[PDB]
Every structure is written in structure tokens, then in C-alpha cells.
Structure 1
Amino acid sequence: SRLLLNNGAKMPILGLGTWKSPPGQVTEAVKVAIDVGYRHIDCAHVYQNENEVGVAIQEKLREQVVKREELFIVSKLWCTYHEKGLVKGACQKTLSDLKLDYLDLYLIHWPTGFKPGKEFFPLDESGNVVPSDTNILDTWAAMEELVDEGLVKAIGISNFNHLQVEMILNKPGLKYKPAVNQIECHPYLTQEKLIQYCQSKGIVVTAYSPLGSPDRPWAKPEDPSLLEDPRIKAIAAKHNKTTAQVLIRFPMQRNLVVIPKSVTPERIAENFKVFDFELSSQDMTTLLSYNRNWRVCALLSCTSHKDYPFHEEF
């Protein structure tokens, strides 16, 4: 139910995601998740709902349903705060909203830095995203000093390709290794090379968008659906489970942490019932064979950023 991180701490293999969780529904969603047994919540400043997540975490701590040490709370540093001087301030804002005094894990959300300001995606007059001239190594040094300050227990990365991870691992004077690389992963984008790489380096991998992110704002307008894939429905029927429960169990058997998002009380409960069954090795191989290198999250407005992660093979 928990994986060991390089800092000695143990991270719950199942967590609740909160991207697209409306402020008016996420407090209830998080309260319900904690009642159901969830101990790991995935957050981010850019989701614009950390205040409302924090209300839920506070209510459950006050009720003594959980101790703080039992909870594993994750947030992420947005691209407009990559400058060395802004990193502490971004972290502190998140800590306020969440009403916590430390984070368990703090991630660099994307390797790309943007111009600092009030817009999450600052645009020029041609409407292109304005980059910062910062680099990955300077932002990492700022994250390291968050640990020395006691603001966060562990630091990691998100959406880094293997060369970008390499770059941090080879940093002269590297003090804290990345604990976690959080990346998109499901049967259509299986990530076998990047997962072999990080796992060889002792970096834990967290699978985001495990259900294919059916609610992502962008179109595909209609088209491909994991929850509705008839081959994946077959594997679920055979186990008397739902296809969502199969999609969540899949990354767990590859030793990944997984963070399905739901604001629906019955689905939050359904998504928790994945510890009591086992996919066969035949099932696992079959699901891996469905890979079609299809990304939900390609950050398409930054495709010419100097640090865009998805031009490399893995």
C-alpha cells in the first residue's frame, strides 16, 4: 500500500487527483476520500483550488480521523516561479492555502520556465508563450534549499524526459536526488523506457491521467476512450471489477503510484477497491500491448520552448 522513497519516507501507492476539481466540490471530495481511506492527495497551485482542498484536510485533522504524519500531501511549482528568488514564495503560498506547515513532496510541474507574472501562460503580442531564461539546474538548487529550510520533506519532478533527469543526476554538488518523476501513463501511453530508466535510478514513478483524463478541456473532440475500450472491458468483466478499477490496478502492479481524479463520492469509493485483486501476467502483457504513444498532456503551446520535454524519445 506504500512505496519507499529515497528520503526514507513512505508514499501511499494510491492518491486522489484534483486537477479540474471545482472549488465548490473538492472540499467534499477530499473529506470523502479521507473517510474512505485515501492518505495521499495530489495538488497544484495552477489548479486554483488549494484553499478548498486545505479546508477538507483541516476538518479531518480537527476531527482526528487522521494524524498529519499519516497524510502524504503533494503540490507542484508552476512554470512562472522557476527563478531562484520566487521558488520559496510559491511554496509558502501553497502551504498557506493548504493550511499546512510542510509538504511531503514538492514537484517541478514542467521543466519549462515562463516569464514571471500573474498569467499562468504569459503571451507576447503574437500570442506565443513567453519563456524565462532560467534553466533546470538553477530551479533544482532553489528546490533543494526548501528541504534544508524544513518546508518540504522531499522534492521531485514532473514531465521530465530521461536526459532532463540525467542532467539533475549529474549536477555538480547534487545534494538531494529527485524522489519522484510524475508522468502521464495508461494503456495507450505505457512509458516502458522512461519507467525502466527512473526505476533503475531509484526514482519512484507516479502515473497521472490513469483513466485517460476523460474530462480534459481539450477536444480529441470525440475519439479514443480507455473507459470504453471493449478489450479493457473484457479484462474487467473477467475479474468482476469495473474498467476504472482495472486501469488503476494496472500501474500498481508495475510498482507505480497512481492518482485517479474524482469529485463523485461513489467513484472515489469505487477507485479505492483495488487492493483486493490481482491482474494475471497475461492481463498485464495484454494491456501493455495497447500502447499507441497517445498523450493527453502535450503542453502544445510550448513546443518550441528550449526545455520542451517531448521531442526526445523518452
Structure 2
Amino acid sequence: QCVKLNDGHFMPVLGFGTYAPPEVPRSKALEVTKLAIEAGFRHIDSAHLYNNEEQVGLAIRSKIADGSVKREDIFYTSKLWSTFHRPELVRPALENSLKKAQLDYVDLYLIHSPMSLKPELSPVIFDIVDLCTTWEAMEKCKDAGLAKSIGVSNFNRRQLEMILNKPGLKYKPVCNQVECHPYFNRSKLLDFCKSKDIVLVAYSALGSQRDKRWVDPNSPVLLEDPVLCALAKKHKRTPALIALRYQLQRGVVVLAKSYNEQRIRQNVQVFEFQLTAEDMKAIDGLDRNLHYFNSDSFASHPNYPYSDEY
């Protein structure tokens, strides 16, 4: 089950999220990425930021070498971190991710965030960079064959239009990877992306990992929502599967992180059932503009995506 991107390539609609906090041994990323592939995951989402591209690439390479899959079956994503937005730093950063993962190309390279940072990953000191020049450098990475497709992450409508209306544009972003779940369903952004043939990719679709460093512990726990729990009972599934199936039926490609073997195998059950129209309407009604990731300290950045929240 894949969706056709605006550049002709195909993206599996269910992806495996590989981020785990530093307290989790790096060995786990190798272990679970293999478990994900064995369970049926073909879309693997990583990033320079996650400090796991070595282990994630090892897992993909091992499952190719053991005959389980071919490289063409795997959709691997990495992301350009914000300290490498200056156009001369874009390609070296991609080559470095390819070297670490021992891959010849990524299937998808994304701008991780529009909020450019001073050329340490977290120096916070900002950098003024016209993202159109960053995008031009990304386009050259696709022309060189290092990235099959290119896209963006954490862009708002205004920032997408800055790219879509760039003079001399060669490649539209194939996708915009943003926070998306029933408490923050991005309906307006989703309609906009659909109208421009851009795929919205959902992260934190299961409510986020609720890390005390980024997430307010008092924020509501998505997977304990009464509506998702009732719907989980009706369909004999789980709240997680309801939240994942919700995204698929509204045209969103959805990521799901799990470092637990049983839940990794569970999340591929999203293709085994359907939600009713009334089920989807009830989930729609949970929307409350709730971002689990508190970026309020970065609200001063000229490219802060959540501007005009009030």
C-alpha cells in the first residue's frame, strides 16, 4: 500500500519511526528496525538528529543481505538538520548521512525544520537563510541521484507556498512531515497539501513519546482518549490502531514509532480493518490545536511555523 508522489516515485503509507531518547542504547535501533522490516514495514524514517543512522542503515543492509528484501523494496528517509541549511552545506550533510547508513541513496531527504540554526547540532542561536536557496541545493541532490525524492518537515502553509512559488522551481516538495494526530489533525494544512499534490506525513500520530524535556506532562494522553478507547472496543483493536487508521482513511501517510516487539507487529494491523464515516467524524471532533512538542522558546525565530497561534 503506497501513494504516488508528485515526482513519480512511490511512498508506503505506513512508516516506522526510529527516534528513541538518548537513554535507549543505540543497539535497540538496529534490533527494532529489523523487527519492523520483518513485521512488514517498508518505510523507515530516520534523521541526522536521531544519532541512529548507523544502526538503522545496518538493519536495512542486513535485511537486504539476508534475502528478506531488496533495496528497491525499502523506502528510507533521512533529514537535513537545521545547522546545514546554508546551500553549500546541504550536499555534504546528505553524503555524510549516506556514509553513516552505508546506503548509496536515500529514498527521501527532508528539510527537518524551517528554523535555520547557526552553523554542535544545538548551538539557541539562529541563522538567517533564505530557504529557497536551501531548496535549490536539495534539488541538486535529487539530480545527482543521492535522494530519489525531496520534501520538507514542519513547514506551515506560508512556508510551503514560498517554495511552490519559487522562480525557476524544478521539484515541488513531495511531502510535508508535520505533527498530526486527533488532537491536532491539521485539516486545513491537509486540504492545502492535497490541492498542491503534496503528501502530508504524520508524526507523533500516537500522541508522542511524552518526553519530559519537550512535552508538558499535564497534556492529555492521546491513547487514553475516551473516544479512541470506545472505538478500540467497537472494532476489537487498540487506541493506537484507531489513531493510525484514522490518518490512512483521510489520505495521510502515517508514521508509528515503537521499540516494543509486540507493538511493532501490532501496528501493521492498521490494514486489517476500517473505520465508519461516523467513527471518522467522532475522531475529527477531538481536534483541539494541541501540539505535544513545546517550541515556545523558539517562537522568536522568523521561520517559527506556529506563528499567529493567538
**TM-score under structure 1 length normalisation:** 0.95
Q: Look up the match of 1:291.
A: 287
Query: Aligned to 1:205, what secondary structure does the other structure show?
Result: strand
Deviates more, 1:299-308 or 1:103-112: 299-308
Whether the 8 Å CA contact 1:77–1:106 is kept in 2: the answer is yes
Shift of the alpha carbon at 1:132?
1.3
Instruction: Provide the C-alpha distance between the structure 2 equivalents of 1:133 and 1:208, rounded to a whole number of angstroms.
Output: 27
Unaligned runs of 5+ in 1: 123-128
Q: Look up the match of 2:13.
A: 13
Shift of the alpha carbon at 1:223?
3.7
% of aligned pairs identical? 48
Whether the 8 Å CA contact 1:298–1:310 is kept in 2: the answer is no
Q: Does 1:111 align with 2:106?
A: no
Instruction: Provide the C-alpha distance between the structure 1 equivalents of 2:129 and 2:237, rounded to a whole number of angstroms.
Output: 47
Whether the 8 Å CA contact 1:15–1:38 is kept in 2: the answer is yes
Equivalent residue letter for 2:125: V
Equivalent residue letter for 2:299: T
Shift of the alpha carbon at 1:298?
4.1
Q: Look up the match of 2:166.
A: 171
Unaligned runs of 5+ in 2: none
Query: Aligned to 2:192, what secondary structure does the other structure show?
Result: helix
Query: Aligned to 1:306, what secondary structure does the other structure show?
Result: coil
Instruction: Provide the C-alpha distance between the structure 1 equivalents of 2:154 and 2:215, rounded to a whole number of angstroms.
Output: 21
Aligned equivalent of 2:205, options 207, 210, 215: 210
Whether the 8 Å CA contact 2:200–2:253 is kept in 1: the answer is yes
Shift of the alpha carbon at 1:242?
0.8
Deviations 1:202-229 (A, max 9, x none): 0011011011113434342244111111
CA RMSD of the aligned region, Å?
1.2
Question: How many residue pairs end up in the alignment?
Answer: 305
Q: Look up the match of 1:44.
A: 47
Equivalent residue letter for 1:66: V
Shift of the alpha carbon at 1:148?
1.1
Q: Look up the match of 1:92.
A: 95
Query: Aligned to 1:274, what secondary structure does the other structure show?
Result: helix
Q: Look up the match of 1:120.
A: 121
Deviates more, 1:292-301 or 1:47-56: 292-301
Equivalent residue letter for 1:111: P
Whether the 8 Å CA contact 2:210–2:216 is kept in 1: the answer is no
Aligned equivalent of 1:180, options 175, 179, 190: 175
Shift of the alpha carbon at 1:74?
0.5
**TM-score under structure 2 length normalisation:** 0.96
Aligned equivalent of 1:56, options 50, 54, 59: 59
Whether the 8 Å CA contact 2:219–2:292 is kept in 1: the answer is no
Whether the 8 Å CA contact 2:14–2:41 is kept in 1: the answer is yes
Structure 1's 108 and 219: CA in aligned 2 closer, same or farther, altered over 3 A?
Answer: closer
